Write a protein that binds this DNA or RNA. Structure first.
Lengths: 136, 386, 63
RNA sequence: UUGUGGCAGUCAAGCGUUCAUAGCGACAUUGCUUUUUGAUUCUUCGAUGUCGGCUCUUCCUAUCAUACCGAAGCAGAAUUCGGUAAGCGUUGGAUUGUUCACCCACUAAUAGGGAACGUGAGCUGGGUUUAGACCGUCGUGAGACAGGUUAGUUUUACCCUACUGAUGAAUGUUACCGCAAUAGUAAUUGAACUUAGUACGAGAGGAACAGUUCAUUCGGAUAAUUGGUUUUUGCGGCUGUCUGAUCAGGCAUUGCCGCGAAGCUACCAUCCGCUGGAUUAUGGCUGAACGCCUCUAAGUCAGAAUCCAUGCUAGAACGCGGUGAUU
RNA sequence: UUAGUGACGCGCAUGAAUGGAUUAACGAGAUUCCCACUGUCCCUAUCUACUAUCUAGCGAAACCACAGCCAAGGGAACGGGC
RNA sequence: UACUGAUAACCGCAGCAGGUCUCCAAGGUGAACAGCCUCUAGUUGAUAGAAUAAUGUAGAUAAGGGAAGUCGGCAAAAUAG
């Protein structure tokens, strides 16, 4: 995160590498999000940068609105589909992996969210909490 | 010509040579720094790694998010019956190092420890230490003066102790034997303390206490001759590759026309001496006690031994230790515990720990029940339960 | 702490032991074991599975 | 050898609001390097396997970043110049055979180079580099073209050395406990909250040390949990067929499916990753020469990712000690 | 996006049976992109049979001045020897 | 005018996984002298024994992502009646 890190983050098992397409949850016009980068990413050789839950990323739209399409944009993950482990040891995973468009500071360009999200993202990105229906 | 794209040294070279140890009992290289203001006491201990398990407690670091919330943590369990003190040796210092000038043993010994002296015990006269006992069998005939020699000399003293492998559930009957440094009080006091403690048990309630950070010293599990790919963390070469991909491709340049030591190479993995540190103790517990597995919050009377036992070990009917996290060494194995060398405060070594629940479920599967009472309760009776 | 109930087997889930699943409709399921998890992904009926508490209580066993 | 390529100096007309030197520095000039490209032809034509990438280590520093510092046309932030410094790190992709280049994006930063233009009994064989074939141009023609395209066998280590691991005679024997020469060594960087919207700044904007929680990279272990694996050929089921039918079983190159313990294993999981001294640069104390003055000349303080120790790894198989029993 | 495609054409050196321009279908032809799929890959792990391994028995070959520890030096300018 | 007619009688330096013309051709599954099992007939030959380290050969599976790999989706998967 960095800029819009309202506090810190605990590591989350990583399942969304570059090349990953993930759903878009919000009301911004999009259908999918092609990850291409990650903020705070590590720099190792022939290692793919992997996103997580809460990790802001740069993404593209391969499917959706022609105002959003053919340009990068910051985006944030809310769902992972990869079993990670909270400090209470609960191994949990969604069925899908999705995210939402944003500005660099973290405020969703979209005004709502369609489905559940992660409590980590909800605690780290307050605007997502604002536009959240359900959290976990 | 240079490396096109940079990347770091695969592996760590301080931990070389990667070779089989000299023993199944890791040498304690270094003890703490002796001080006199404190009382005479041990600075190490011996047990046997039994296995791992999982617990629950309430974290307290003021500024986390799980501050004052529950967590769950992997712990490691050691069976630590009280060690029998027999003997002490005296180390005088030289420009060539510390050096033993005397090793004083005790009169009476156990079959286990003199078995450790022997190899083929079943065909033996069991002739050992008899003339030592006959140097005993008098007031002080040839012992008092060795002790006073150690007093006059010997800046350092190390007490010889041995374990109770017959108190363990193991099948060895051959005791383990070792030395420990004492880091308390004066030298005369150390030696007379040890003289008092000849042939005597010493226990973990005396050596350690909860929320103490320690070092675990042991030999790490053997994995045989192994390739570079698991032994070092090297990139698997690609699919199309004649003559092997679980390899290193280049092992050095033309000049120097030699294989550099730093290059990776296949060979022994495991059975390695390792000394891990900063392992907070979470519970001392007692063999001669039940409810070892029961916290103040649970209060369900139950020991630590799970249903069907520890896998490859059995029970914990002796005094035992539960420490945070992993340690070097596999099940059924010796382990050498040690006080730290440095007063690490850090708001991590001082975090006071009180427990809530302890998984006493079967590790020989995916155990749903911590207790057969609970099991029968959930299930109802059974065909076998007439 | 607390203990919970597998959606499938209906079994106590002591802390950490087992998996959790969060469907898109925000239904939070818990599974003591990959057995239950895999059956769930197969879309099986525990009322038909015999060793399950639902079958047990639907056939009136241990009453 | 070093023209040329690259790098660094001397001098200072000028630029820089004013002022040659904060920073740049034309005209002129002295050097260095061999990572270019030439020049030469000493070795090599009874053959040193020939571009690049991949992999992987190590080295230099002319330091991109990080540690500490000095200078500024440095208010603060940001930036520039310079010193000790090569300890530590220097990416993922698009197109191209590519070196190189150019873009995208993250980044603390995405510095340059060497090791027979490192590395083919280590790979690959895109390219180049035989034979087939197509085009263009040249040629009367056979045929030519660092012009373009396509297709085109990449052999052997069982020897010595080096390397990793592993044994081992001989020391009066045998067993146990130890020492510790020497060698190796490792931990790295960032973010967030707070300090503080404070300092500073007319305003615009906008810090820092300490403290806390977290993460990146690397490492060393471990397998409680989760995941994977499943010849437990453990349980159940499924197809075809054979055993008169059933029960129970064979064959199906482990027949197939679902579950699946144990063991192995994963930044796909977890745990851990030390503190003291001497020092550099730099700033200084007293202090003369030079009756002043000056960090220096004698002496002397603090001071870094440095260096050495603590610690960690192996233990000299011709380094040693203590102890027990010794037919 | 030095690729791919569509256009432009003072085309170093396009071009008409030295055949030109298209062209359905066909192609183990060359090439680009999209869907699916995937251990190619992030990043490796695990399992099986046959090997290697040890044994009994059998039992070659290539190659070989002599042999087989490094550094620098100079030297046929890159030594195992000096 | 016997016999073989070929993973030992032929040619391949040989008791070489190669090559060498043809006739007969059961039952079930199933579109099928496919593949798989069986009957008659024929074989039980190929150095064997012990363990199961690496590296291999041949076969397979792998969470999340999905060609980011690479000269290039090569190989493998997925689809399949």
């Amino acid at each position: 995160s960095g800029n819009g890190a309202q506090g810190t983050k605990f590591r989350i098992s990583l399942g969304l590498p570059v090349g990953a397409i993930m759903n878009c949850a919000d009301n911004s016009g999009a259908r999918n999000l092609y990850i291409i980068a990650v903020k705070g990413s590590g720099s190792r050789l022939n290692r793919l940068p992997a996103a997580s839950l809460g990790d802001m990323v740069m993404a593209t739209v391969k499917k959706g609105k022609p105002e959003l399409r053919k340009k990068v944009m910051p985006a944030i993950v809310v769902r992972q589909a990869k079993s990670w482990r909270r400090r209470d040891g609960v191994f949990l995973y969604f069925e899908d992996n999705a995210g939402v468009i944003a500005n660099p500071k973290g405020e969703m360009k979209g005004s709502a969210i369609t489905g559940p999200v992660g409590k980590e993202c909800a605690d780290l990105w307050p605007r997502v909490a604002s536009n959240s229906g359900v959290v976990v | 010509s240079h490396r096109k794209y940079e990347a770091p040294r695969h592996g760590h070279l301080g931990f070389l040579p990667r070779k089989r140890a000299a023993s199944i009992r890791a040498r304690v290289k270094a003890f703490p720094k002796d001080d006199r203001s404190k009382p005479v006491a041990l600075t190490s201990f011996l047990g046997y790694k039994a296995g791992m398990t999982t617990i629950v407690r309430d974290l307290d670091r003021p500024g986390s998010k799980f501050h004052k919330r529950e967590v769950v943590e992997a712990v490691t369990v050691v069976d630590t019956p009280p060690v029998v003190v027999v003997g002490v040796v005296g180390y005088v210092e030289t420009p060539r190092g510390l050096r033993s000038l005397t090793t004083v043993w005790a009169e009476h010994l156990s079959d286990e420890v003199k078995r450790r002296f022997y190899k083929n015990w079943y065909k033996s006269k069991k002739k050992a230490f008899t003339k030592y006992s006959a140097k005993y069998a008098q007031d002080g005939a040839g012992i008092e003066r060795e002790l006073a020699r150690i007093k006059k000399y010997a800046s350092v003293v190390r007490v010889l102790v041995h374990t109770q492998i017959r108190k363990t559930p193991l099948a060895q009957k051959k005791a383990h034997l070792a030395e420990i440094q004492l880091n308390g009080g004066s030298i005369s006091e150390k030696v007379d303390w040890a003289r008092e403690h000849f042939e005597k048990t010493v226990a973990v309630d005396s050596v350690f206490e909860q929320n103490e950070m320690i070092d675990a010293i042991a030999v790490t599990k053997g994995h045989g001759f192994e390739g570079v790919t698991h032994r070092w963390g090297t990139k698997k070469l690609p699919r199309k590759t004649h003559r092997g991909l679980r390899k290193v491709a280049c092992i050095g340049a033309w000049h120097p026309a030699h294989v550099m030591w730093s290059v990776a190479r296949a060979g022994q993995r495991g059975y390695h001496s390792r000394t891990s540190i900063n392992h907070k103790i979470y519970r001392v517990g007692k063999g001669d006690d039940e409810a070892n597995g029961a916290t103040s919050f649970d209060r369900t009377k139950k020991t630590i031994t799970p249903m069907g036992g520890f896998v490859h070990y059995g029970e914990i009917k002796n005094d035992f230790i539960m420490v945070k996290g992993c340690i070097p060494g596999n099940r059924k194995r010796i382990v050498t515990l040690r006080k730290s060398l440095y007063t690490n405060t850090s708001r991590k070594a001082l975090e006071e720990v009180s427990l809530k629940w302890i998984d006493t479920a079967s590790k020989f599967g995916k155990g749903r029940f911590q207790t057969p009472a609970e099991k029968h309760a959930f299930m109802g009776t059974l065909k076998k339960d007439l | 702490m607390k203990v919970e109930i597998d959606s499938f087997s209906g079994a106590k889930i002591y802390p950490g032991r087992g998996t959790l699943f969060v469907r898109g409709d925000s239904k939070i399921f818990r599974f003591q074991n990959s057995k239950s998890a895999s059956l769930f992904k197969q879309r099986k009926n525990p009322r038909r599975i015999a060793w399950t508490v639902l079958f047990r209580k639907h056939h009136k066993k241990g009453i």
